[PDB]
Amino acid sequence: VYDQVEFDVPIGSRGDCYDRYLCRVEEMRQSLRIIEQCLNKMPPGEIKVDDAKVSPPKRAEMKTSMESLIHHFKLYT
Amino acid sequence: PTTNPPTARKFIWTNHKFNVSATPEQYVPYSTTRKKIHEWVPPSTPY
Amino acid sequence: SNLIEVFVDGQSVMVEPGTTVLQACEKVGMQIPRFCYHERLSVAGNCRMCLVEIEKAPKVVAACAMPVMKGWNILTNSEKSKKAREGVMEFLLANHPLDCPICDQGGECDLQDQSMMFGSDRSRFLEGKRAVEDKNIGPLVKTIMTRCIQCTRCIRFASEIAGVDDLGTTGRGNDMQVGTYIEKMFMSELSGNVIDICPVGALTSKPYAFTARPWETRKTESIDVMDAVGSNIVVSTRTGEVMRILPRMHEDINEEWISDKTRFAYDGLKRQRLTEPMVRNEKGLLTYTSWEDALSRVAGMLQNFEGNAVAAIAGGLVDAEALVALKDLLNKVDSDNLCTEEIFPTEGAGTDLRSNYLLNTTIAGVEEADVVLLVGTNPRFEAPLFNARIRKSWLHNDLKVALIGSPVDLTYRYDHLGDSPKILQDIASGRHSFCEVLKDAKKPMVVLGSSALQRDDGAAILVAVSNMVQKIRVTTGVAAEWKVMNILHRIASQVAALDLGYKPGVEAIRKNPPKMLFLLGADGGCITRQDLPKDCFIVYQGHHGDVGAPMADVILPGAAYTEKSATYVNTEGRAQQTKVAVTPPGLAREDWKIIRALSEIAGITLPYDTLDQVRNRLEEVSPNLVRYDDIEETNYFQQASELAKLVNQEVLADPLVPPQLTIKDFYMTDSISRASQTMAKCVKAVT
Amino acid sequence: TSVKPIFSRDLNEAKRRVRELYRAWYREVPNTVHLMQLDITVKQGRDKVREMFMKNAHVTDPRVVDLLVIKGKMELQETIKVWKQRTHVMRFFHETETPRPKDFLSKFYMGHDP
Amino acid sequence: LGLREIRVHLCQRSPGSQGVRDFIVQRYVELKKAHPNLPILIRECSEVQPKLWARYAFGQEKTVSLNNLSADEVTRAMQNVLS
Amino acid sequence: QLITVDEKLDITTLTGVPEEHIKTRKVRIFVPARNNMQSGVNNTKKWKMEFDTRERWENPLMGWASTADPLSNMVLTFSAKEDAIAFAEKNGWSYDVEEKKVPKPKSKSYGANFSWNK
Amino acid sequence: ITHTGQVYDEKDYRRVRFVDRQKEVNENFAIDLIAQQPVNEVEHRIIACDGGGGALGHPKVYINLDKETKTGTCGYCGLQFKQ
Amino acid sequence: VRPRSDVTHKQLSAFGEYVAEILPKYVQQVQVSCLDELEICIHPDGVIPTLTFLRDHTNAQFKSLADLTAVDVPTRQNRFEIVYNLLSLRFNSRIRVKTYADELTPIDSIVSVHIAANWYEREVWDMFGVFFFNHPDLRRILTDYGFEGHPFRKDFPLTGYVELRYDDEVKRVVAEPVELAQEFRKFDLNSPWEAFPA
């Protein structure tokens, strides 16, 4: 999501090691603007895709459902 | 730990130790597996 | 002709009429997820995990059991055929106990993978599971049968590949448990295959219970040396000790199966094993010493002794490469008293034509035979994967089996002509009833076991059989490439030894006692030290201290077939190469080098210094040794008979009896077998 | 057959280049033994150069030879433009490692797999 | 020259070996009957011309090529070997 | 213009392998069989060439397996027998190819199991 | 000594390692500690051992306590249950 | 399931045809992955020409070289597969031009077309052994000064053949043949069951 957060790229003008420093200091400031948006707009939801084939099954599920233990065993091994 | 004491499980240590590395109590690594290829010991009785 | 064209997703494959839908997908290359269907086991349809969708058809069809029909398109990956698998896998898993970190068929599961590949990611079985009481089916197979997916491949194998017919289904509903109704152990050779054939880890191997996990196991493809069928096998080694030996498929020799002996006697390979070269001390006990000292003990005696005072009694599991290195050495001191423990009659042409001593009708020729005349051997316990051959060809084809031996359990219906070597003469005369049966056979085969030959009238028994094969051939008018006479061995290093011109039997050593004897892996009692001359200077060349070690002035430890790139050859002369799965233990060394080195310490120094050279050597003395996997087609039976006719001998009335009368006889035979704790546990279970 | 030429059209032209490199190394051995304070003899080193230049005497193909000198030239550059310090150079002499016998009896006495 | 063994490494279905195999078919039995102890080995090479290997006493082996040789030349060569 | 060479590409001189492991190492080109445990055949498809196995002595301090052979764990995968043979020739390793052995066609039909006389 | 009877022989030199040092071993051995726990007398043919603590325990498994003679033992805890 | 826009698979596809048409003497295959990435494939001789057209064409300006790499398919006669990934800051698109080079059949160098390649080409020589003609200064970059062998080749042992330790006798670091105290455990991981037709 860098399409749903708003920031300004700090383009420098001339290229001396100062303009590059100033750009790096601005990106720290612009990142605080992006961090602000992320805390303000973080959605309720799951943190990993729900396909057991790609992301490992949850600890409770692998210890109670056979399809999850098989998926945990195969994914880790 | 005083306020909410921990769970005791009748194996956990009562005297916990600090780094024993310079002192003789130190872990000395060793293989814990038993022998694998047992050998034919020669007959002790002269033929 | 006979080539329907069926489309597997529009690929227009063409198949013989009769091919199943699963088989049609295989030739295109697609693989229907399958349980309960094994190529060499009958189709049962129990799992229904293979449901596919022929085009324009209301219901999905059972791949493994549906004769394909013209035009059909399989739609194997159709949305439907995936719901037909996403919903079956739901069921197999629902009653399954999730102890995958107990199930030692962890990575060797055709049910997790077929679930990780063809099934769903979750479960909806919020209800409770079932549990089935376990069974002590035996001391080799651990049946944690709460794992069973009721796929009935065991009940098939236990009836179709092996003739046990014991395992069976008991009950109906969700508590159908596939275990012996009364607790009777599944005691039979071919027993351990159930492990390999149950895709679930319900019943698995008890010795290899929890020693490893398959991803770790490094897999080296080698050859079975315990029996003379020379079954192909894969030795699974982890961090340098063998963990398991499981079959690898050879269409002609062992087609996916291996004997109970050659997969649970890998444990015997790890104890009582010689490693350092001990020598007899002044005190009279074997003292471990460096090679240099042990080798010159032997070399000095060798230089002192002339020809016919030095002899070698090889035998058992020694490879062809050592056998030529021991002959080349003893000829360089001119004794050609090299011999093997198993006596093959050698008064007529023996060892000279290569058909007197081979099963030249191939292991795969038992499938196209018509009548088999088993004479004096128990195939069940002398060549278990050849007994199976006659098992399959008596079931799927129609072999008429006849045994002239002891009436013995043969896992099939044989005709017991009698227990007398002279009744062989009865058939030759045409007097006995089965004489016509053969007359009626267009492709017959006689099989004379080596153990019948090991009796005193073995020369006469071979001659008597050759006469009958002669007129059987004349009366049937069988074609030349069909070969009626063949003899099966039960010692791995016997066909190779006879090939290199080793003369069978210790009869020659018996008549003149050698001052020196190289026992190259001989644990047999063919000669003993009381029998030897006063000096009795003999040096054991082998891997396990059993009978030859404690009566040995020198111990030169060698290796075993898991530990060297040697060559072996089974009974119809197919030479095969063992590969080094594990480096040999201790100071122990490869058999061929010990003898090349002893020669260099002696001054007759064998010309070969690298294996490839020892092989080139094998090529000059014999052809089969260098060409691997290649049976030698032509043979010269006609001239063999002429010399048989010259030989006159009496077949004594004593019935010819196989030494392995019942299965306890079978479990412990060779050195590695004898040294097996698993075999020992099996022996006491029988007793 | 039908190969494209890397830099040398034929073993002949290629050999020319090898000659040049040999000379280069020959002229350089002394300098290195002094700029690196190596404890070796110029003569000794120069023989080593010969050793290497012949270790690959068997190559018959022109393309393989050409790469061999490219690589050879690169090594020289690392030793004359000094980026390779003594540890690097002396390694050529295999000074610390214990030599292994090639006699069969010798190997038999020591290693499982020769 | 002590003769210990003779190896006739014929090659089946090979043009040259025809003579060798013919010898085996017609005279092998006879030779054996005559020398009933000596081990005469009939072996089958491939993609190699036939060789009558002979092992003399004290580990010396000698070679006589039988490539494209007639049945009696094979018989004569064999007879020359066990002098 | 191209030049002609009949010399089998041998590039043993460029690969950078120690002399001992180019002249004493035999590699086998084989198609892997299937552990009988599983019935899947997706690991019996591509040819692999594997170098000969070497010493695996036990380590004294921890008992871990220890190996002195560098080319041990290396198994290269080649799609066809011809290509794998080529790799051995130009790299100079000795080769001993094993022909692929594929299961022979087997005739099966559910009707048979209910045969009047089998 | 250790859980598996790992005891360096009287002549092995790894014993030098233990010279002037403690060979680390644990007095609490599992083979024994599980024994102490008594057999659980459940009253249902099949019971489940979730491992104690559910998600904080071991994968759930059902044990068949039908065999009257023996007692079911969780392949995980080792806990035994009898009907 | 990832969101896929076919706008790109169409735009990029068309461009592929455009490049191919403009440079037919070298373009052998031009494909767009299902991941919306173009991958013109060129004969090794077209290294200079195809790149230059992309660096300096108004309708396809591909100014910077993202990367130069060489996969090694040992089976493939031409072992290496030099892959050049380029970016067009003007058209916000990347393309990959991949060629094939065998061990002793060198590729041309593009240091002229992009000087970024001065280092990556040295990296490809050091790791894989491909040689680049007309390179200003080709010499090992990542490997040790005396290293023998090209490391990322699939035929090179991971642990390698030499390791370093300090020897007192000689008071200097010294190579010795590698002796490992726990060999790399080579877990076999491939499952015997396929996933889909692909």
Ligand code: SF4
């Ligand atoms: S069989 Fe063993 S491994 Fe395969 S799933 Fe059931 S438990 Fe897990």
Ligand code: SF4
């Ligand atoms: S035991 Fe193995 S084979 Fe016999 S049924 Fe249960 S699962 Fe199928």
Ligand code: FES
């Ligand atoms: S395989 Fe189709 S029914 Fe089990």
Ligand SMILES: [Zn+2]
């Ligand atoms: Zn538990």
